[PDB]
Ligand binder design. Structure first.
Ligand SMILES: CC(=O)N[C@H]1[C@H](O[C@H]2[C@@H](O)[C@@H](CO)O[C@@H](O[C@H]3[C@H](O)[C@@H](O)[C@@H](O)O[C@@H]3CO)[C@@H]2O)O[C@H](CO)[C@@H](O[C@@H]2O[C@H](CO)[C@H](O)[C@H](O)[C@H]2O)[C@@H]1O
Length: 241
């Protein structure tokens, strides 16, 4: 056990310990690793290579700005990875490529404006993808193939539309967060999101400390009128960015 942390069973608790770096002494037997709520500014390559039994890894609420390539490649049994509330500016290609059993991925509250094109291609069992509070301008490629998603959080980004058909195979969705985006309702491309929301009013959620069903929470930029109320006649292909 790291001297700054407490350990019990296969759980290592390094949460809220004012840590500036990942401490030594985490047993290779560890299955749950709390490193959240610290001041970790970077993760060294190979730091997780020894921890092949991890199933849940909490790196949220730190000061991470980048991740080295291959950082997680040994964590083949990982099912939850939390990276929210950091300062991640970009991700390397294949950063999640080996996390084939991952079920929950937290990326909200970073500085991401795009993702590598194949970032989710191997996450065939993913159920929750929460990426609020970044600066995304397009739906990341690959999300349309995460057919097992129950939770998809895209709120508080910079999305203007959703590519046609992107949500149609996400038939297990129960929670979709779309508020806080500047949806461009004069552009003809908004019609897919409009049509999809109108058919899935029960799964569009707002957030006041918790999920609250609100299909009007996806709002048009400027008028702040509901996206699902847009008429096609009011839109035009020539009014798109
Ligand atoms: C990894 C994760 O669960 N992230 C979500 C985040 O989790 C916070 C929540 O569990 C609260 C519950 O009290 O605890 C916070 O942790 C505390 C900790 O308990 C304290 O002892 C001390 O250490 O400080 C930390 C941090 O303050 C967890 O961080 O909760 C937020 C919402 O508050 C979620 O973000 C929302 O996600 C929604 C989709 O699910 C939606 O997009 C919404 O807009 C987001 O705000 C994190 O996903």
């Amino acid at each position: 056990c790291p001297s700054q942390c407490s350990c019990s069973g296969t759980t290592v608790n390094c949460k809220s310990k004012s840590l500036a770096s990942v401490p030594a002494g985490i047993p290779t037997t560890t299955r749950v690793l709390y490193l959240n709520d610290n001041q970790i500014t970077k993760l060294e390559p190979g730091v997780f290579d020894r921890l092949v039994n991890l199933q849940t890894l909490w790196l949220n609420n730190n000061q991470l700005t980048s991740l080295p390539a291959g950082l997680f490649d040994s964590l083949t049994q990982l099912t939850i990875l939390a990276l929210d509330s950091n300062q991640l500016q970009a991700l390397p290609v294949g950063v999640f490529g080996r996390l084939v059993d991952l079920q929950q991925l937290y990326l909200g509250s970073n500085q991401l404006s795009a993702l590598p094109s194949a970032v989710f291609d191997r996450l065939v069992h993913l159920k929750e993808l929460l990426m609020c509070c970044n600066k995304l301008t397009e739906l990341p490629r690959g999300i349309e193939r995460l057919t097992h998603l129950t939770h998809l959080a895209l709120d508080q980004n910079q999305l203007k539309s959703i590519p046609h058909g992107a949500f149609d195979r996400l038939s297990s969705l129960t929670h979709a967060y779309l508020f806080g985006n500047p949806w461009d309702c004069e552009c003809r491309d908004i019609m897919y999101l409009r049509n999809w929301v109108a058919d899935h009013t029960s799964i569009v959620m707002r957030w006041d400390g918790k999920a609250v069903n609100d299909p009007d929470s996806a709002k048009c930029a400027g008028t702040n009128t509901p996206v699902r109320a847009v008429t096609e006649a009011s839109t035009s292909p020539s009014k798109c960015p």
